[PDB]
Design a protein around this ligand. Structure first.
Ligand SMILES: CC1(C)CCN(C[C@H](O)Cn2nc(-c3ccc(C(F)(F)F)c(CNCc4ccc(F)cc4)c3)c3c2CCN(S(C)(=O)=O)C3)CC1
Length: 221
Protein backbone atom coordinates (compact mmCIF):
# COMPACT_ATOMS: atom_id res chain seq x y z
CA UNK A 1 0.00 0.00 0.00
CA UNK A 2 2.67 2.52 1.08
CA UNK A 3 6.32 2.75 0.02
CA UNK A 4 8.74 0.91 2.26
CA UNK A 5 11.10 3.93 2.24
CA UNK A 6 10.78 7.69 1.71
CA UNK A 7 13.49 10.39 1.61
CA UNK A 8 12.14 13.81 0.64
CA UNK A 9 15.72 15.09 0.36
CA UNK A 10 16.09 12.93 -2.75
CA UNK A 11 13.32 14.98 -4.40
CA UNK A 12 14.98 18.35 -3.69
CA UNK A 13 12.34 19.38 -1.14
CA UNK A 14 14.61 19.88 1.94
CA UNK A 15 16.80 22.90 2.68
CA UNK A 16 20.16 22.79 4.44
CA UNK A 17 20.22 21.88 8.11
CA UNK A 18 20.09 25.04 10.24
CA UNK A 19 21.72 25.98 13.57
CA UNK A 20 19.29 27.17 16.25
CA UNK A 21 21.94 28.03 18.84
CA UNK A 22 20.89 29.25 22.28
CA UNK A 23 17.43 30.27 20.99
CA UNK A 24 14.66 27.71 21.56
CA UNK A 25 13.21 28.16 18.08
CA UNK A 26 13.08 24.48 17.03
CA UNK A 27 9.30 24.95 16.76
CA UNK A 28 9.91 27.67 14.14
CA UNK A 29 12.40 25.54 12.21
CA UNK A 30 10.05 22.55 12.25
CA UNK A 31 7.38 24.84 10.78
CA UNK A 32 9.34 26.52 7.97
CA UNK A 33 10.86 23.19 6.88
CA UNK A 34 7.44 21.63 6.38
CA UNK A 35 6.25 24.65 4.37
CA UNK A 36 9.46 24.79 2.34
CA UNK A 37 8.69 21.30 1.05
CA UNK A 38 5.18 22.36 0.03
CA UNK A 39 6.61 25.44 -1.69
CA UNK A 40 9.09 23.36 -3.69
CA UNK A 41 6.37 20.97 -4.82
CA UNK A 42 4.15 23.94 -5.75
CA UNK A 43 6.66 26.28 -7.44
CA UNK A 44 9.64 24.08 -8.29
CA UNK A 45 11.92 26.41 -6.32
CA UNK A 46 13.70 25.43 -3.08
CA UNK A 47 13.88 28.48 -0.79
CA UNK A 48 14.55 28.57 2.94
CA UNK A 49 11.76 30.38 4.78
CA UNK A 50 12.40 32.75 7.70
CA UNK A 51 12.35 31.02 11.08
CA UNK A 52 13.24 34.42 12.56
CA UNK A 53 10.01 35.80 11.07
CA UNK A 54 8.10 33.27 13.16
CA UNK A 55 10.11 33.95 16.33
CA UNK A 56 9.52 37.73 16.06
CA UNK A 57 5.94 37.90 14.72
CA UNK A 58 4.01 34.72 15.64
CA UNK A 59 4.06 35.59 19.31
CA UNK A 60 1.52 36.06 22.10
CA UNK A 61 -1.66 35.96 19.97
CA UNK A 62 -0.52 32.48 18.88
CA UNK A 63 0.63 31.31 22.33
CA UNK A 64 4.30 31.44 21.30
CA UNK A 65 7.23 33.01 23.14
CA UNK A 66 9.97 33.13 20.48
CA UNK A 67 13.23 31.80 21.91
CA UNK A 68 11.27 30.43 24.88
CA UNK A 69 9.24 27.98 22.75
CA UNK A 70 6.20 27.78 20.54
CA UNK A 71 3.88 25.57 18.53
CA UNK A 72 4.12 24.71 14.84
CA UNK A 73 0.34 24.76 14.35
CA UNK A 74 -0.03 28.35 15.50
CA UNK A 75 3.10 29.23 13.53
CA UNK A 76 1.14 28.04 10.46
CA UNK A 77 -1.92 30.03 11.58
CA UNK A 78 0.22 33.16 11.80
CA UNK A 79 1.31 32.55 8.21
CA UNK A 80 -2.32 32.19 7.16
CA UNK A 81 -3.40 35.33 9.03
CA UNK A 82 -0.35 37.32 7.88
CA UNK A 83 -0.97 36.31 4.25
CA UNK A 84 2.74 35.53 4.05
CA UNK A 85 6.11 34.51 5.43
CA UNK A 86 9.40 36.01 4.25
CA UNK A 87 12.33 34.19 2.75
CA UNK A 88 15.05 33.33 5.25
CA UNK A 89 17.51 35.32 3.06
CA UNK A 90 15.46 38.52 3.44
CA UNK A 91 14.85 37.93 7.17
CA UNK A 92 17.80 35.84 8.42
CA UNK A 93 18.02 33.97 11.70
CA UNK A 94 19.65 35.77 14.63
CA UNK A 95 19.01 33.28 17.48
CA UNK A 96 17.36 35.86 19.72
CA UNK A 97 13.99 37.60 20.17
CA UNK A 98 13.48 40.70 17.98
CA UNK A 99 10.73 43.11 16.99
CA UNK A 100 8.48 41.89 14.19
CA UNK A 101 10.17 42.96 10.96
CA UNK A 102 7.94 41.23 8.42
CA UNK A 103 7.86 42.90 5.01
CA UNK A 104 5.40 41.73 2.33
CA UNK A 105 7.90 42.87 -0.34
CA UNK A 106 9.99 39.76 0.46
CA UNK A 107 7.15 37.26 0.83
CA UNK A 108 8.39 33.84 -0.29
CA UNK A 109 5.49 31.64 0.75
CA UNK A 110 1.86 31.61 1.80
CA UNK A 111 -0.12 29.03 3.73
CA UNK A 112 -3.65 27.96 2.85
CA UNK A 113 -4.23 25.47 5.70
CA UNK A 114 -2.60 23.01 8.09
CA UNK A 115 -3.66 19.60 9.33
CA UNK A 116 -2.92 17.83 12.62
CA UNK A 117 -2.62 14.10 13.01
CA UNK A 118 -4.01 11.97 15.86
CA UNK A 119 -1.74 11.34 18.85
CA UNK A 120 0.44 8.25 18.60
CA UNK A 121 -0.72 6.84 15.22
CA UNK A 122 2.61 6.07 13.56
CA UNK A 123 0.72 4.42 10.66
CA UNK A 124 -1.23 7.65 10.06
CA UNK A 125 2.05 9.59 10.25
CA UNK A 126 3.77 7.19 7.83
CA UNK A 127 0.96 7.77 5.31
CA UNK A 128 1.17 11.56 5.68
CA UNK A 129 4.95 11.58 5.18
CA UNK A 130 4.49 9.44 2.06
CA UNK A 131 1.44 11.18 0.60
CA UNK A 132 1.72 14.81 1.77
CA UNK A 133 5.39 15.57 2.38
CA UNK A 134 7.63 16.22 5.39
CA UNK A 135 5.65 16.47 8.64
CA UNK A 136 6.33 18.80 11.55
CA UNK A 137 6.47 16.87 14.83
CA UNK A 138 7.67 17.29 18.38
CA UNK A 139 10.00 14.87 20.12
CA UNK A 140 11.28 14.29 23.66
CA UNK A 141 14.86 15.50 23.33
CA UNK A 142 15.49 15.81 27.07
CA UNK A 143 18.07 13.03 27.28
CA UNK A 144 21.91 13.14 27.09
CA UNK A 145 21.80 10.32 24.51
CA UNK A 146 19.95 12.70 22.18
CA UNK A 147 22.58 15.45 22.43
CA UNK A 148 25.28 12.77 21.95
CA UNK A 149 23.63 10.89 19.05
CA UNK A 150 26.08 10.25 16.18
CA UNK A 151 24.64 7.55 13.89
CA UNK A 152 22.31 4.63 13.70
CA UNK A 153 18.71 4.18 14.74
CA UNK A 154 18.14 6.13 17.94
CA UNK A 155 16.43 4.33 20.79
CA UNK A 156 16.24 5.81 24.28
CA UNK A 157 14.51 3.54 26.83
CA UNK A 158 13.72 6.43 29.19
CA UNK A 159 12.09 8.53 26.45
CA UNK A 160 8.53 9.70 27.00
CA UNK A 161 5.67 10.64 24.67
CA UNK A 162 5.64 14.20 25.98
CA UNK A 163 7.27 16.46 23.40
CA UNK A 164 9.55 19.40 23.96
CA UNK A 165 11.66 19.83 20.78
CA UNK A 166 10.34 20.69 17.31
CA UNK A 167 11.71 18.63 14.38
CA UNK A 168 10.79 17.75 10.77
CA UNK A 169 10.15 14.19 9.55
CA UNK A 170 11.43 14.11 5.96
CA UNK A 171 11.24 10.35 5.69
CA UNK A 172 11.28 6.86 7.12
CA UNK A 173 12.82 3.51 6.31
CA UNK A 174 14.32 0.29 7.62
CA UNK A 175 17.99 -0.25 8.47
CA UNK A 176 18.89 -3.92 8.98
CA UNK A 177 15.80 -4.81 10.99
CA UNK A 178 15.47 -1.39 12.65
CA UNK A 179 12.60 0.68 11.24
CA UNK A 180 13.37 4.39 11.67
CA UNK A 181 11.99 7.85 11.12
CA UNK A 182 14.26 10.21 9.17
CA UNK A 183 14.29 13.42 11.22
CA UNK A 184 15.70 16.81 10.24
CA UNK A 185 16.95 18.57 13.37
CA UNK A 186 18.04 22.19 13.81
CA UNK A 187 21.41 21.79 15.58
CA UNK A 188 23.65 22.33 12.53
CA UNK A 189 25.54 19.85 10.40
CA UNK A 190 27.84 18.46 13.09
CA UNK A 191 24.96 16.87 14.99
CA UNK A 192 24.01 13.26 14.32
CA UNK A 193 24.08 12.17 10.68
CA UNK A 194 25.01 15.43 8.95
CA UNK A 195 22.32 17.22 10.96
CA UNK A 196 19.77 14.40 10.79
CA UNK A 197 18.79 11.78 13.36
CA UNK A 198 17.16 8.45 12.49
CA UNK A 199 14.68 7.65 15.24
CA UNK A 200 13.06 4.34 16.17
CA UNK A 201 9.75 3.75 14.37
CA UNK A 202 6.85 1.51 15.44
CA UNK A 203 8.28 1.25 18.98
CA UNK A 204 5.27 2.62 20.86
CA UNK A 205 5.42 6.23 19.61
CA UNK A 206 9.02 6.40 20.80
CA UNK A 207 10.03 9.89 22.09
CA UNK A 208 6.55 11.12 21.13
CA UNK A 209 7.52 11.40 17.47
CA UNK A 210 3.85 10.96 16.52
CA UNK A 211 2.38 12.78 19.55
CA UNK A 212 1.65 16.10 17.77
CA UNK A 213 2.31 15.85 14.01
CA UNK A 214 1.07 18.50 11.59
CA UNK A 215 1.70 19.65 8.04
CA UNK A 216 0.81 22.76 6.01
CA UNK A 217 -0.45 23.14 2.46
CA UNK A 218 -0.21 25.80 -0.25
CA UNK A 219 -3.18 25.33 -2.54
CA UNK A 220 -3.46 26.46 -6.15
CA UNK A 221 -6.52 28.50 -5.17
C1 LIG B 1 -4.27 26.31 19.70
C2 LIG B 1 -3.90 26.50 21.17
C3 LIG B 1 -4.47 27.83 21.67
C4 LIG B 1 -2.38 26.50 21.31
C5 LIG B 1 -1.86 25.15 20.88
N1 LIG B 1 -2.37 24.09 21.75
C6 LIG B 1 -1.71 22.81 21.44
C7 LIG B 1 -2.05 21.71 22.44
O1 LIG B 1 -1.78 22.11 23.79
C8 LIG B 1 -1.35 20.40 22.07
N2 LIG B 1 0.07 20.32 22.41
N3 LIG B 1 1.03 20.67 21.49
C9 LIG B 1 2.19 20.47 22.14
C10 LIG B 1 3.50 20.72 21.47
C11 LIG B 1 3.75 20.30 20.17
C12 LIG B 1 4.99 20.53 19.59
C13 LIG B 1 6.01 21.17 20.29
C14 LIG B 1 7.34 21.38 19.62
F1 LIG B 1 7.35 20.93 18.36
F2 LIG B 1 7.76 22.63 19.61
F3 LIG B 1 8.31 20.70 20.25
C15 LIG B 1 5.77 21.59 21.61
C16 LIG B 1 6.84 22.29 22.41
N4 LIG B 1 6.64 23.74 22.54
C17 LIG B 1 5.71 24.07 23.63
C18 LIG B 1 5.70 25.54 23.99
C19 LIG B 1 4.78 26.41 23.42
C20 LIG B 1 4.76 27.75 23.74
C21 LIG B 1 5.68 28.21 24.65
F4 LIG B 1 5.68 29.51 24.97
C22 LIG B 1 6.61 27.39 25.24
C23 LIG B 1 6.61 26.05 24.90
C24 LIG B 1 4.52 21.35 22.18
C25 LIG B 1 1.96 19.97 23.45
C26 LIG B 1 0.61 19.90 23.58
C27 LIG B 1 -0.12 19.44 24.80
C28 LIG B 1 0.87 19.13 25.92
N5 LIG B 1 2.12 18.58 25.34
S1 LIG B 1 2.78 17.33 26.15
C29 LIG B 1 3.43 17.99 27.65
O2 LIG B 1 3.87 16.84 25.37
O3 LIG B 1 1.71 16.45 26.47
C30 LIG B 1 2.89 19.58 24.57
C31 LIG B 1 -3.82 24.01 21.61
C32 LIG B 1 -4.47 25.34 22.00
Amino acid sequence: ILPDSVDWREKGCVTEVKYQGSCGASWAFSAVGALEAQLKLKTGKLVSLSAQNLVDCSTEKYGNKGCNGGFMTTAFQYIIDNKGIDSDASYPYKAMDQKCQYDSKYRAATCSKYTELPYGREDVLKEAVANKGPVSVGVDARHPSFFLYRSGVYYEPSCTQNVNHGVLVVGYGDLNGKEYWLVKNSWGHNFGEEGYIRMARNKGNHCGIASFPSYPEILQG
